[PDB]
């Protein structure tokens with residue numbers, strides 16, 4: 001049942017690519033598809049964008065692409081816009097299983113007057129709206145890839161990976177999980193435990209839910225999946241708390257734990273972890289220092 005992927009030479013590099021393309025000479029990639037991931041009751045749109053890089057901008061799971069949106073830099077006359085980074089949401093083979101495309105999971109940044117709700121196109125986020133407004137055949141200026149914080153540690157194919165996402169923070173984990181479960185990668189046969197926790201606003205805001213639910217049926221002994229709906233139920237930290245003893249035992253046994261999404265997710269998580277630890281009679285500060293020393297703690301928030 002795993003999906004054949006090509007070309008297998010993408011497994012041969014011993015280090016991830018970094019800064020293959022730079023802002024002064026980006027790679028001009030082409031949009032394959034853009035689709036909304038969310039339903040009518042979601043508070044805003046999050047879209048899935050598939051980009052054809054032609055095999056010219058390969059990457060490893062957990063890396064980011066840069067995108068240079070069109071127009072002048074408003075702060076620097078006659079200069080290009082600054083790069084915006086996006087976590088790649090695909091495996092290195094991409095959604096067409098061919099090594100030619102990568103995907104992004106992009107939240108539209110829209111401004112609303114806090115009193116009146118009135119819009120202002122000069123205040124929306126440039127790159128996120130550029131991307132979600134894109135159509136097949138459109139060109140995008142791609143840079144990178146960049147980043148190493150979120151590379152998947154593969155030395156132990158039986159490791160445990162606890163993945164904590166809010167919103168678009170799911171992106172690297174979609175790539176991890178396809179590599180672990182979906183794709184036929186003969187040199188990486190995952191036999192550990194992957195546990196995804198996802199916090200979103202409501203059921204219509206869920207991202208890739210059918211995919212993750214399918215892994216529960218395909219790999220019941222290797223995958224777990226828990227959701228938190230803040231407006232319906234509940235934050236992701238409340239779900240960690242529900243499983244606190246299991247999680248703390250996995251951490252003590254060597255599990256990796258990952259956090260990705262908007263940085264506002266982290267204070268509540270740190271508060272919860274401190275309280276859980278205290279109830280167990282442990283110091284969260286001591287435990288976190290040990291997790292960081294042991295290279296178990298991975299955070300990419302923005």
Ligand SMILES: Cc1cc2nc3c(=O)[nH]c(=O)nc-3n(C[C@H](O)[C@H](O)[C@H](O)COP(=O)(O)OP(=O)(O)OC[C@H]3O[C@@H](n4cnc5c(N)ncnc54)[C@H](O)[C@@H]3O)c2cc1C
Nearest residue numbers: 084085086087105106107109123124125126127128168302
């Ligand atoms: C490592 C990394 C990974 C990331 N991964 C993702 C990802 O997977 N998905 C994702 O969606 N994002 C991700 N981001 C965030 C992304 O890089 C962008 O910051 C985000 O998309 C907003 O960029 P933008 O160009 O749309 O908005 P910008 O044009 O940069 O505007 C920034 C914000 O300012 C607001 N604003 C602009 N004008 C005003 C004004 N006058 N008054 C009030 N508000 C105003 C905009 O509405 C917006 O909210 C990631 C960031 C990092 C660093």
Ligand code: NA
Nearest residue numbers: 038039204206
């Ligand atoms: Na949905």
